[PDB]
Design a protein around this ligand. Structure first.
Ligand SMILES: O=C(O)[C@H]1[C@H]2CC[C@H](CC2)[C@@H]1Nc1nc(-c2n[nH]c3ncc(F)cc23)ncc1F
Length: 156
């Protein structure tokens, strides 16, 4: 499996861990069957885009943590969407609200890039502690000191 690759306009580089691929069929939130390569394992990545930078920890169909820095709200949102799709989480699969048309991961990404409101509302939030250098981000992509999208923090 490749150590560096591109997804959603971000260069990903695996800095720790490894995964194996297992083909699985998942049911989307539009009741469509999708055949995807699910990655199994613990991994850490960097993400570098033109307008945002992040560190992503993940496990099998599970986002662990995304620490993201970006130029503005929109640029941060772009990184979050890519990370949420990349995670392969079921809540992301179940947030699909269209029939998808081609690589299935790319179709998922394009769908959420078009409108991420259901993705962000269904993802979940959590309370956060005041940690120096970080802040929370709400489903509407605005900041909060007290709560954040689950597993997501913004570097500031
Ligand atoms: O699976 C693919 O066809 C490609 C598509 C474009 C980039 C990504 C994500 C989709 C994937 N390629 C690659 N994906 C991965 C990978 N590691 N861990 C993952 N967890 C979820 C995932 F979803 C993809 C990966 N490691 C090396 C790759 F080279």
């Amino acid at each position: 499996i490749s150590s560096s690759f591109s997804f959603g306009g971000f260069t990903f580089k695996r800095t720790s861990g490894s995964s194996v691929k297992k083909e699985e069929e998942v049911l989307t939130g539009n009741l469509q069957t999708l055949k995807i390569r699910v990655h199994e394992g613990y991994e850490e990545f960097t993400m570098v885009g033109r307008r945002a930078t992040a560190i992503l920890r993940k496990a099998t169909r599970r986002l662990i943590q995304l620490i993201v820095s970006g130029r503005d709200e929109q640029s941060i949102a772009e990184a979050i969407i890519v990370a949420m799709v990349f995670s392969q989480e079921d809540c992301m699969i179940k947030a699909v609200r269209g029939d998808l048309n081609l690589n299935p991961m790319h179709q998922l990404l394009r769908h959420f890039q078009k409108d991420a409101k259901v993705l962000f509302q269904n993802w979940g939030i959590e309370p956060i502690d005041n940690v120096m250098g970080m802040i929370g981000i709400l489903p509407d992509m605005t900041p909060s000191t007290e709560m954040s999208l689950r597993g997501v923090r913004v570097s500031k």
